[PDB]
Amino acid sequence: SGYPIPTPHSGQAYDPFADFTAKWTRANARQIKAQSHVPVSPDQNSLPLNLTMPDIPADFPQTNPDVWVWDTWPLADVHGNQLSFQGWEVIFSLTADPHAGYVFDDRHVHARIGFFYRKAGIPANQRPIDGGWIYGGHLFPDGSSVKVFGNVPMTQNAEWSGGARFVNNVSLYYTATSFNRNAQGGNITPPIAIISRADGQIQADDKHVWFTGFDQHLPLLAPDGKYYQTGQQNEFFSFRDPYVFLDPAHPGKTFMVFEGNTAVQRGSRSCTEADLGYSPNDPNKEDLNAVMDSGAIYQMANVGLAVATNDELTQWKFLPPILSGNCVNDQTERPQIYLKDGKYYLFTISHRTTYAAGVDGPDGVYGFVGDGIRSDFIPLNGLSGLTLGNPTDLYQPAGAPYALNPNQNPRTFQSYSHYVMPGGLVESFIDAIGPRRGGALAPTVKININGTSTILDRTYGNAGLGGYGDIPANLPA
Numbered sequence: 001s002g003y004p005i006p007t008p009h010s011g012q013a014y015d016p017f018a019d020f021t022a023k024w025t026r027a028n029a030r031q032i033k034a035q036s037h038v039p040v041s042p043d044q045n046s047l048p049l050n051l052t053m054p055d056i057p058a059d060f061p062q063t064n065p066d067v068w069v070w071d072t073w074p075l076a077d078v079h080g081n082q083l084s085f086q087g088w089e090v091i092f093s094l095t096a097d098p099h100a101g102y103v104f105d106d107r108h109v110h111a112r113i114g115f116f117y118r119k120a121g122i123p124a125n126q127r128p129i130d131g132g133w134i135y136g137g138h139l140f141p142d143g144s145s146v147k148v149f150g151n152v153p154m155t156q157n158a159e160w161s162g163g164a165r166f167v168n169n170v171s172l173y174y175t176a177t178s179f180n181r182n183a184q185g186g187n188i189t190p191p192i193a194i195i196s197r198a199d200g201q202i203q204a205d206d207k208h209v210w211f212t213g214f215d216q217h218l219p220l221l222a223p224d225g226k227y228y229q230t231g232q233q234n235e236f237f238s239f240r241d242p243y244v245f246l247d248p249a250h251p252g253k254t255f256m257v258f259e260g261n262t263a264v265q266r267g268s269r270s271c272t273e274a275d276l277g278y279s280p281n282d283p284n285k286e287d288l289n290a291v292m293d294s295g296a297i298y299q300m301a302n303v304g305l306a307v308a309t310n311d312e313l314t315q316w317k318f319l320p321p322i323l324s325g326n327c328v329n330d331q332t333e334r335p336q337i338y339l340k341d342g343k344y345y346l347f348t349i350s351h352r353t354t355y356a357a358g359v360d361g362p363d364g365v366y367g368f369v370g371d372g373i374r375s376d377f378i379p380l381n382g383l384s385g386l387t388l389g390n391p392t393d394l395y396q397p398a399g400a401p402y403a404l405n406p407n408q409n410p411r412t413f414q415s416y417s418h419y420v421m422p423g424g425l426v427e428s429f430i431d432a433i434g435p436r437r438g439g440a441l442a443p444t445v446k447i448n449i450n451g452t453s454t455i456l457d458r459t460y461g462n463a464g465l466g467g468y469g470d471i472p473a474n475l476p477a
């Protein structure tokens with residue numbers, strides 16, 4: 001075997017205030033490829049079937065014909081219960097315009113937060129194929145989001161993901177972004193990313209849902225340069241996707257996970273033996289200098305933690321990160337803390353194309369398990385971290401969603417932004433399927449979480465495929 005021993009992990013809980021960061025190591029990450037098989041043409045899937053998202057039909061419906069929809073989150077509480085209001089289900093999505101001239105892959109800097117609603121508890125025979133979502137439109141008033149950036153030079157602004165907390169009964173945590181780009185789309189000045197809070201009121205009658213408020217935006221967090229990488233340290237830094245939750249182990253407190261980057265100057269040779277995570281005599285180890293020479297120093301993802309410094313939840317303090325992937329992958333996005341069986345699962349999304357040199361894995365969801373919000377997190381499924389990937393041959397090149405390589409599974413980029421719901425249901429959006437780009441919700445799927453491993457449930461729905469955009473409420477608010 002050419003694949004190394006994975007770095008062991010205890011699941012041990014630390015104090016949330018402790019400077020301890022669990023490492024998603026190269027030796028961990030390399031288990032994905034190790035666990036895989038060389039696909040058997042006509043087979044274009046290397047992944048264990050248990051870790052594969054089933055194939056989404058190319059005839060998928062739009063969520064709305066007039067809107068591009070991608071990152072989505074439900075109406076929820078700090079317990080991650082999904083909430084209906086007066087018999088209505090409510091979701092929030094990043095939205096953009098398909099006919100405004102810009103292509104799907106440049107949608108990001110034009111993103112606005114919209115909402116959709118529909119009646120809860122409708123059976124499949126009465127739900128339309130597109131999930132029956134009614135477009136509510138833009139959640140925030142024009143210009144409310146961009147106020148945070150005062151007078152700075154900018155060539156666009158956008159609203160990026162977070163979460164909705166019913167508590168003005170509704171708090172929308174999200175990422176305000178500002179960009180200053182030239183002709184070629186190079187940064188004149190480093191992008192600005194600020195985790196913000198806007199409060200408003202959901203209202204409904206028998207015929208619709210609507211909101212008021214969200215007029216006054218509260219800036220909460222931007223990178224410090226000590227735990228989380230600033231624009232000045234790295235023009236291509238990431239800082240976004242707040243998930244706000246209560247840890248029952250820590251009442252009187254409210255916490256937040258979010259995507260960050262390790263705070264170093266871009267190009268620093270700052271990876272250690274810890275990030276590689278080999279045993280000394282493992283024949284399949286790697287040399288640190290060899291790894292840093294490959295350019296893996298440009299891949300320095302982390303998941304951060306913050307805690308409310310008041311009851312108002314209007315003031316937040318940074319804690320040390322709870323997970324790094326230094327020299328493994330530059331993106332750990334939309335992190336969430338999922339409570340099951342008295343355990344803590346950290347789920348986070350990542351891209352095949354953001355892996356460091358010498359490491360490889362699919363687009364989809366990665367999971368880690370521990371005894372606390374800050375653990376020596378155990379990477380799920382063979383100490384790999386992969387929970388659920390798009391069907392992918394890791395023995396062939398990635399391609400891109402705008403340029404599909406026909407040596408590669410045409411559904412390698414079929415879904416992204418996997419969000420884990422109560423009972424292990426997973427919602428996501430469709431990126432590329434063959435020539436077609438989605439901007440629409442994927443079929444909901446279901447994973448059975450079983451201690452250190454997970455299984456895609458193929459008895460769920462249509463051989464694992466539930467309804468398009470099936471994001472259901474558990475609880476009335």
Ligand SMILES: [Mg+2]
Nearest residue numbers: 138141142143
């Ligand atoms: Mg308008």
Ligand SMILES: [Mg+2]
Nearest residue numbers: 352355359360
């Ligand atoms: Mg690669």
